[model samples]
Target chain A: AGTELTNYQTLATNTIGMMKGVDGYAFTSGAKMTDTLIQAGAAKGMTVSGDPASGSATLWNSWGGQIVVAPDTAGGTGFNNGFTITTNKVPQSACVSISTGMSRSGGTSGIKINGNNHTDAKVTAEIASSECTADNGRTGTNTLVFNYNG
Target chain B: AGTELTNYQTLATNTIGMMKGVDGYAFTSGAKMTDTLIQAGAAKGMTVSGDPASGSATLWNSWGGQIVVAPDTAGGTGFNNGFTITTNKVPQSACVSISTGMSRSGGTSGIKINGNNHTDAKVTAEIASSECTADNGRTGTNTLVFNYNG
Candidate 1:
């Protein structure tokens, strides 16, 4: 409204931050679009559920597309007690990636997706000590990425 | 005057969600009338103080009204390293219940509340395997509930 619509054609740009609901869909402040996208993909077939008590959630999007956030509370396993979200669904025409985080204290030791490095086929992102060592204190923040028509 | 009245009404109704204080009272998402009722009872006592690191929280409501979410990370115990929320306060009237959740990875292998299932009671809910086996990765989501007169 500031610039007249007739005299000079102005292009209005807008940016949406986190936690702002578009319609009825809502998310906490610390949420990503990939979380929603993964949820949508999973809605196609099997239902989605999470075990917050164990700090794990699974998205059955596709056999390969399925994402798993499994925290190994039982230590002694080569891997850190941290969680893992494994997704195999890579659209033939789209690009995707996954990232993990935490609320207070967290570190990622390893990350493996498809291939070892990024080469249009596989992209691996690692968090130094992402695994959890103490059952008393730990948090996991996860993310999923998708780029279509790229 | 019409605009002012509309504004006041909007404020009145808009304040209806989780964790809102109304008339010197507090509430949760699915709290029953008894839950609030018990809180009023706790008001008669000193107060509540908790430390998540130690896996213990207290409410000055009754003799054993105190609640504790204990995480046994040391292991050696019959149960694996996990978290537990234990309460001993049994309401005289209506039942009461409590539930538990987590931030990242957790599990509820054991749950104990009042007799009321999903209802109200002097609940002692314990999520077995809620604690991380190691000190590397773990998250805690704690919750407390109370119920009084039905």
Candidate 2:
């Protein structure tokens, strides 16, 4: 649960700034924006028109879903420690990479692919294979949430 | 959590019998088992060896993940209502369908794609497209958890 926006002005938004200089906070309400993305394989590449770090930030994904960057102290915990990089509405084809890859780097924090808590746990390639489905006639949505400090 | 099982040897492990004749309850700790499967589309088609209902029930999926059928009467709830159909490790390409679909049927119960409670919320087609990824050289894992009573 964070901010919800569609677009951003010049350098007005960014990822690091969302943290409010805090260790794990986001720029502002985690900067949940919806925009077109440049696909890099299946995982998210970058916004079509924005900086991910600072100034006129335009975060994005392959399937123009909402990109969320919120804090880490909303679940009844202590102060901020690291912000979260949540590429909302990730395609069913790319859910595996983002979730597993992010965890591989460092996860004393947290990682929730869909809703299952895989904290610091290696989700075998088998589980990360085909988690999506075509239940509603159309395909399904595979949302992703990843907490980071970089 | 209950009596954990990896496989069944007879036709005694049927879905209807798991509840011990109770409602909403699964067939013995929801019978967590593993087996190979044949992927139809993104969602789970059916088992390749056994009947999901009774007698040497051999459930399956495309990725060959874990198939869990647990009861739904342990969360401080009521009596055995229905059973939960959990196709663990459904692969990345099929996360959206299963998560979104299982909810579309009759979610007066509960439908948790990843972890977020969609209850009866329709995860728009917008959110169902391209939800997987191609990071970490491999892909990601979009685990799904759905609670049903049929």
What candidate 2 gets wrong by more than 4 Å, as runs, is A1-28, A32-45, A48-58, A74-79, A130-140, B1-150
Cα lDDT of model 1 by residue, B46-118, tens digit: 2345433434334332333444323323235332332333344434221111232211112233333333232
The regions of model 1 sitting more than 4 angstroms off are A1-20, A24-150, B1-64, B72-80, B90-107, B114-150
lDDT of 1 by residue, A1-150 (tens): 111111001100001212123567543311233234323332222223322232122333322244443323334654333223343443321222122221111122333323332213223223212221112122223223211111
User: Model 2: what TM-score?
Assistant: 0.32
CAPRI verdict (incorrect, acceptable, medium, high) for model 1: incorrect
Error of 1 at B107 (Å): 6.2
lDDT of 2: 0.42
CA-only RMSD, every prediction = 22.6, 21.3
Q: Each prediction's interface RMSD?
A: 19.9, 20.5
Candidate 2 per-residue lDDT over residues B1-150, each given as its tens digit: 001111211111344343354456223443332211111111122223323232122343444455555555655755636655565555454566554554353342555555554445455434644443222333336555555442
The TM-scores, chain A only, for the candidates as listed are 0.28, 0.55
